[PDB]
Amino acid sequence: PPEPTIRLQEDPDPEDENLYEKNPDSHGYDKDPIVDLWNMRVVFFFGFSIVLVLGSTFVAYLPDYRMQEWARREAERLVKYREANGLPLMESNCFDPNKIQLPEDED
Amino acid sequence: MLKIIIPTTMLLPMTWMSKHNMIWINATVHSLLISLISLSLLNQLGENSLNFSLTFFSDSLSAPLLVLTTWLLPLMLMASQSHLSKETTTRKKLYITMLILLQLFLIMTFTATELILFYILFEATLVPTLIIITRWGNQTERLNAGLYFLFYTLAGSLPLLVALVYIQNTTGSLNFLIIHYWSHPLSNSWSNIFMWLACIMAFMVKMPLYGLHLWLPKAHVEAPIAGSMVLAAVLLKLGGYGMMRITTILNPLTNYMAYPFLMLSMWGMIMTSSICLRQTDLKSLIAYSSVSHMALVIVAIMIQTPWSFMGATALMIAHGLTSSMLFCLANTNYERVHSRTMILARGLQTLLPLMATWWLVASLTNLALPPSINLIGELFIITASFSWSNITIILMGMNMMITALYSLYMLITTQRGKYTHHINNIKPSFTRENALMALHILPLLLLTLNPKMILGPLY
Amino acid sequence: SSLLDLIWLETILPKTTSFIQMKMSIMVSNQKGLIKLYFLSFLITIMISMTLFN
Amino acid sequence: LQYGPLAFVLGERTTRKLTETSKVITVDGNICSGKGRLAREIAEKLGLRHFPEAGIHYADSTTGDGKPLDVQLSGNCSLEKFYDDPKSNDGNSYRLQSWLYASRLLQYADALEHLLSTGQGVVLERSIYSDFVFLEAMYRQGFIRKQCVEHYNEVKKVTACEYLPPHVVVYVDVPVPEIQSRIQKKGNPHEMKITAAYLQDIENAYKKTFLPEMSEKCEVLQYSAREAEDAEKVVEDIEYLKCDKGPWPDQDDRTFHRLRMLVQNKLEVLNYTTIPVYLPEITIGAHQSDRVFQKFTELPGRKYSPGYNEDVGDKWIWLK
Amino acid sequence: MNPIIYTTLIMTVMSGTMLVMISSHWLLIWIGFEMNLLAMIPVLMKNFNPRATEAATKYFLTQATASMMLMMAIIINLLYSGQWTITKMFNPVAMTMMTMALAMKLGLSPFHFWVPEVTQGISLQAGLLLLTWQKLAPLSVLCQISQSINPNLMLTMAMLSILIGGWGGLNQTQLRKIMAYSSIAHMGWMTAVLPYNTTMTILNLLIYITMTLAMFMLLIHSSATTTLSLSHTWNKMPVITSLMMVTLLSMGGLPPLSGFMPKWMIIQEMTKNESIIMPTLMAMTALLNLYFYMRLAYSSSLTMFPSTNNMKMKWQFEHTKQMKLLPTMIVLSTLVLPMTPALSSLN
Amino acid sequence: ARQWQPDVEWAEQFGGAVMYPTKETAHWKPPPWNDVDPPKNLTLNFGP
Amino acid sequence: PHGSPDWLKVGLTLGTSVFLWIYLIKQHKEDVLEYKRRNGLE
Amino acid sequence: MPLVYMNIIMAFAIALAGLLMYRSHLMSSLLCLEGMMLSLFIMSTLIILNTHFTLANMMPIILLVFAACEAALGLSLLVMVSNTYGTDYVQNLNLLQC
Amino acid sequence: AKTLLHKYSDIPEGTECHRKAYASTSIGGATGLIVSAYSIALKPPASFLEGVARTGRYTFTSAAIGAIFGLTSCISAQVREKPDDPLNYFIGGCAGGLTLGARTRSYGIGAAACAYMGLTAALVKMGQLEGWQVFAEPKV
């Protein structure tokens, strides 16, 4: 059996490289310390400073396009009027029956 | 809507014309800026929708999904920056290009005034994910996982195209607005039954349903961290969005039709939560937890009540964020250990305390601890199911308990106990990983202050 | 985990499809290259079409 | 106007360039024989073009700059290691043999291209013909396996079935003890380690197979060391003989057109030297292949096409 | 051969096709088919070897039988109506025999057996010509007499072609046989819409011809005829492998790639005529074509196969001959979905 | 530590004459690398 | 190999592009004018 | 439709079937093709003469010419096939398989 | 041709069990003979006697499958007193499938036959009821 016991010419599997050994304060971003530090800074500034803070403030102070206070005021004025008239609050029928034309059965 | 689409398209020339060592910095910054731009869409009305043009519209069901899709890209870039270090510039640029194309396809998918355009983009999202899974994958089974992921999807979705073209031939329009205003009842007929099945199964396979959930563990385990993130966070929600959009035409046929699916999901959540208890893999455990959550979302959509829809939307958003965080944590462990098995590396709280805190918060938010939005969706869906039937609660009860169990199990196996004596290459956690976890977790605890922002159009 | 998820759910949809497609491909593609058999099949299908579609 | 079907259609006919002096000739000698000296004098006297024997980096001399590239980027083998350890574990022996055969094939293609495009004849050392004698000796000495010679035979058949044999083959015959003595007198420490059995197998191989097979389709001039010193008699023998038994008299204009299109486009010439048969001595893994290809790409003038390399000094790139 | 002779033969093939396309008399159509048959044979035998001779004689036998059946159909049509103009067929099974002759000419099932053999025997350029240009004339005749065809027989042979192509492509390691089975399946897709809309047939023909041209030119550029021979291309031309993988995905019918446009339209058209089951079955069967395309993509560019040592020398040389239309073909076969409505141009 | 890439054994599966070898097709051989196969003057006696 | 920018091919390419653009502009102007005249706009 | 035309079409069908049988001898394949063209010529000539289509008298000759040219091509091919094997047996062409 | 189709379809579903069984057996025999002819043309196994034995085996298997299909479906439809119900065709279809499995002697192939023939029979019944068209005419 003169076979070399090697299936093919292969590079050895390289060992993992540590970013901390060649550079303390390595931030886990890049092997180049300058690009490292600037990438850390831009990620922190454009994520925590800009998006999470300004965006949260913007979402918090969004105008009432859902019309919740509008609906509350409409209901307040409506109930104020109905109680005075003696009307029984909200009607059972969503549409007035006089303008609905039922089909006569005659069965 | 083009104010979001055009910057996403411009992300590609910017990446390809970038300096060889400035791609990550440029991509993250501009992705975060595009995410900020996406925030404008959140200010919805109680009226119809935000109809920008004939091609794209916005909705308070579409807006949270769009915001999450935009927010996911910087996180995916930061997660992928680590293991692509020994890689040529061209292939890193190709990876970033694939991520950008995936975001663009998802953004166009979520607006999609027309159903055929929605289907085209819904299936266009398939190619970048397949290439990411089968190219930058570590194990030899990534090819089989890619084949499973492709063919399950296409087998589910090919009848959907025929159903859609038939529906347009009969009705005359595939536009969402026209369909909603001109919806007419479907008679209980065999042809209508098969049309319902063709309309539903394509979105059912991607949730995925308990019967059809096999592709997901393979795809999640074999994909890189960015692939796992995008699969768990956004790609699973496409089925739920499609069901919520297409179910309007289906009634009144859904009530009779829904039983096989309701039973499959109510038993499959228990089955998958129980499977999570006996697992030797982090990624598989997270995948099965995702399957359980999406089975609950399927139940919510099939019940088809307002509370069901709000709970489904909230649960989809919360699960996306939580599962992305969990996969990121598992990948941080794997990049140090290179084994991706829970029982090997133990007692990591002693060595990495802050990362253990992140693990605790992620496991708590997966456990649906109040007042997190996870439990908001959980409780809305549970209440809707109880109104649907007072017996469902029992199953739901089991699910909750089982969920908590495996969550804390995953917290106890890897963080508590005694550290393995032999492993010595556990270096201190980097600033990048801690920033990744913080950016994953802070939006959840911010959203729990304003739940209505993610409760959908039926709020 | 093992009985249903790893075995039977796998047996039903994916494995059955793989086996059926493999068998069909093997049957169809296994032709020895003899135009004798090809043209005998051609005669058979010609006569069948003459007898069936009119 | 690069040579193609259009040139052949319009004016380009290579039959008119032949002036009975082309006469492709290959000279073969045993190790340490002065085959090169005889061939150079033949080329000078007959007015032909001499081709130095193809080495490890022969292909490097024709692409880009003539300076040879790194051993790992070109050949991935060395003759010195073969002499030191002919039974090396990494299979350098058959890798050396295969690379040398491929270089000889490229050299033969270049010589044929020059002969067809100019009409001036060429003189060659060991060509793709008679290159198998080293294979046979290496097999008999146990340096290589039987799978290696099977792969060599496959590649040699597929490649050499497409070319015209040399008009005249010239052999210089020298005794084994004499060539060993020349080996010590040479002074090369690596060459000192050649065993007498290896030379005897190689010397024996030329006589047993090469002469008989080429005598039926070529013209052979067996010469000894003394009578090979004077090239006047050699050139006289070359001129007196007339070739009418080989395939060359049967060729015509269209066959020459096909052969000239064949010898050009060296990529298709070397097409079958990389056939997908996996022998451990020559197969290379994906990671090593990727890394070595990237290193070759990072060479100064190899990233782009020859005329599109900015760092070398090519100008007007944006308008070519 | 002599380049002048090759140019003359190519022009004769094209002139026969044009004579078929422009003539209104059945005899002139048959004469054009004869001219194309006569001029095609030497093209298949440019590289002389027993394989090419066997492929050429098989092709000649099949095409001569098809021509004889075509003439018999023409003569029966003349017998039952003294007409030579190419119009409605005017008769029973005379039309059946006409359809069988045109199906054998096109290579549709059950007359598909000769396509893989002839494609494997001949070289890549001859295969390109055979699989691209040799479909124009029979499809033109079928489009002309489409209102005559019995839908049952045409649809049966189309479904058979799709099924046989899908199943037969799964078992192949040779690239030329893969292309032949792809051609069979694509012709099956083409002829299933002839009874309903010939414009869709022509659109499918254009898209398929573009994709096949791109694929064959990519295969010629990286001169490989086997899966493993193609697996060595990444070590020299990775961009070629990437373009090839994109083209293969396009040929699989994946959106948003160009190859999705025909099937989509065809399915759409078939739904207008109250037909659902056949479009469904056609899509589910084209899934098999996608599977073997995806296997080829796995072996081509998504994974890096082992290489050989001599490959290093190939790193030092560049292709002398460059194909000018290859870049355009790739773009047209990849990125023309948004221009879909342009099919109203009656292409 | 390194992404998996196909080895020689993986590559060999696609080198057969056909995919999915069977007992009947086991004896089939791949076509030659170039599509050429091995190819594998009378006498007259004018007597009186 | 060792080649200069072929000014013949460059000139032909630029001339073809400019001619095509000019012809396209002229065709568009004529089409607009002809459409206006046919529909009686101006 | 008289019986003579039916007999001619039956003859053509018999020739086509015999071509499709392939016992051996590809020369017999060419013979079957030539019998088919002969039947085509005969029946086309009978139909044209009967209806007095004067200008159609061109067509049979044309057909004959073209068909005979085809035969020549086929014969050439046969020779080369034989020139490889020495015999024109059909089963010798088993190199190409589906 | 379509003569067998007309013979089978003309008989009412809930009556004349023997006539339905005979029509189904004839259709099965024709299908088996066609399949046998295809197999013989594509693959000559060894000889004339083996070929005719193979044709007989295939034809009788298909005829038995069709006979069991017809008898079981018709009997189920008659006893259930609910005609035009695809469930009867499901039951009869995989009674035929189970008979096929018994003939081939494999439990797995028997269960697969029940699944994939009951579903097919139910689909054919649904198509007959709802008017689905396998080969639709060109409407427009």
Ligand SMILES: CCCCCCCCCCCCCCCCC[C@@H](O)O[C@H](CO[C@H](O)CCCCCCCCCCCCCCC)COP(=O)(O)OCC[N+](C)(C)C
């Ligand atoms: C480290 C230890 C602690 C130190 C710090 C101590 C201080 C603790 C205080 C922090 C929280 C404690 C609770 C105090 C809450 C007060 C603020 C609160 O009231 O404001 C909320 C406002 O918060 C926002 O509503 C929610 C935040 C928005 C979330 C959007 C996410 C940010 C975008 C990033 C990308 C998205 C990724 C996920 C995609 C969906 C609710 O406002 P609301 O009652 O309504 O009305 C406001 C007044 N109006 C009527 C004029 C409008």
Ligand SMILES: CCCCCCCCCCCCCCCCC[C@@H](O)O[C@H](CO[C@H](O)CCCCCCCCCCCCCCC)COP(=O)(O)OCC[N+](C)(C)C
């Ligand atoms: C594998 C992992 C999960 C995959 C997804 C599974 C979910 C899809 C399953 C589909 C659910 C049921 C389909 C049809 C339900 C119709 C209701 C029926 O079951 O009830 C009776 C129907 O009776 C019988 O069920 C008849 C059908 C019997 C044939 C069906 C096959 C049964 C088992 C097959 C399951 C295999 C599914 C997967 C195939 C690959 C009612 O009697 P009837 O009043 O008359 O019919 C009412 C309907 N009408 C009005 C249109 C006429």
Ligand SMILES: CCCCCCCC/C=C/CCCCCCCC(=O)OC[C@H](COP(=O)(O)OCCN)OC(=O)CCCCCCC/C=C/CCCCCCCC
């Ligand atoms: C696992 C998914 C669930 C599968 C459940 C059933 C599986 C068994 C079915 C196998 C495929 C059957 C193909 C033939 C079905 C025929 C149905 C049909 O034709 O109805 C079409 C119907 C009416 O036909 P017309 O003739 O036009 O109406 C006029 C008279 N009323 O029109 C339509 O609705 C067209 C819609 C296409 C139907 C979809 C066909 C495919 C089956 C439905 C999808 C279910 C399988 C999904 C696969 C899941 C994999 C993830």
Ligand SMILES: Nc1ncnc2c1ncn2[C@@H]1O[C@H](COP(=O)(O)OP(=O)(O)O)[C@@H](O)[C@H]1O
């Ligand atoms: N086919 C071959 N195999 C191995 N070595 C070879 C082969 N051909 C040539 N060589 C090497 O080429 C070297 C130079 O050749 P040689 O004629 O002996 O010396 P010189 O160039 O001075 O005339 C020799 O040392 C010989 O080993």
